[PDB]
Design a protein around this nucleic acid. Sequence first.
DNA 1: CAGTGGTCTAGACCACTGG
DNA 2: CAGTGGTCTAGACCACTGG
Lengths: 231, 213
Amino acid sequence: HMNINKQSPIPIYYQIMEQLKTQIKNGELQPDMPLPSEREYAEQFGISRMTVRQALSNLVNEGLLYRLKGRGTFVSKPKMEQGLTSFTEDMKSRGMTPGSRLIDYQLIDSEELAAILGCGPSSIHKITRVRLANDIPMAIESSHIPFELAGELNESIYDHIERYNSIPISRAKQELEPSAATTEEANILGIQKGAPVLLIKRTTYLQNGTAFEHAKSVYRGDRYTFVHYMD
Amino acid sequence: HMNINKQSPIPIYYQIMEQLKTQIKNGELQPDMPLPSEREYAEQFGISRMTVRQALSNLVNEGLLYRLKGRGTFVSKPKMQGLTSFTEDMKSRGMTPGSRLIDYQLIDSTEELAAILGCGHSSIHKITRVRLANDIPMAIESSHIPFEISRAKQELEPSAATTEEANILGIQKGAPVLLIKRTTYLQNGTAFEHAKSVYRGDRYTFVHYMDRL
DNA sequence: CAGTGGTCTAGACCACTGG
DNA sequence: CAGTGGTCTAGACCACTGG
């Protein structure tokens, strides 16, 4: 039971997206069942087929619908989410309360390797946090960021990056590698020395196709498994 | 320079997509230098604005270009992979993959295994290969299929080598290994292969790319 | 067959951007 | 200001599925 206002400042395709999205969650529409036609939709609202099509085409492009030559447009088979996740979002996803304990900060310059994150010789933020879940330490996170891409700040946080620049967030590159806990890794995380940890190098790009952050993290092997989902 | 076949059975946006893709890889077009206007493209080829826009839109959707309201459409710099087997994963690393079978079986279905995919307690293939890279042991892989493309689910977990694990791979016992459970589903929405692998920590790092908005 | 998505056209106004 | 992507319209032919 759908409603579209051509007069609204909110684009018509978006109105059609946002509402259908809920008609699916609410299961008012059922998977492996066709929707009204592109042409039928276009009439019911008194808009152009292509304007129907832009919303539908976006939803299919997001996996919520699918198409069959000569038959129609169909709703889909539900999904789960994790791409592009931070620790806080990774935890809320596992039903846990994310936490943060700052343990180190510095401003240091740069070897050639730090320059490899698309250096703009420059001054860098180096925040070393301890990541927690239900107040249990889960990981140690060393985050690397330039002043040529963030300047300075007093944080009290993802959006600052897209805010300080033209560009939004896009794609990310994670490198995982297994290790045994060093005595300081072990100490902080509260595990035995030599205990299995997971070393994650996450470098993150703008839609610029430019990276802003390179993060070396250490994750406890006992309480954390990396879950991933591709294609 | 760029060429459009309006009569051809391959659509015009796809023609535009494909060529542009190479002008970007080849660097004929430069990152952070804008493309010709949407309107400029439409004239230069003598086609409609919107069908140019379908090509670009698709490319921007693939991470290869980005748009700036009021300014234009710009290129992005980064490199390519995606969708992994052991063997494509190695070729990607400049290496020649190999396989040595060390076990094969058909066993009953236990419920935990059975919970993935359908019915169980039903005939399951269990192939255990030792995976090779330029003739080095890299992993020990126990792959599971019932005998009865799309999405994949990988779970990584770090560990220390058990003594037989160490044995095969030719590494010290207790050495850092990487435990990967790779479940892959068909377009059916039904699971196809469940693989429990063990990877040496010394010579292997897991690499992975993410998208979202 | 009448219906459907996939593609395509030749125009239109808007909000936004930079100089 | 003039240019750009963002949106929209009212038509069109096609190749394809089903009864």
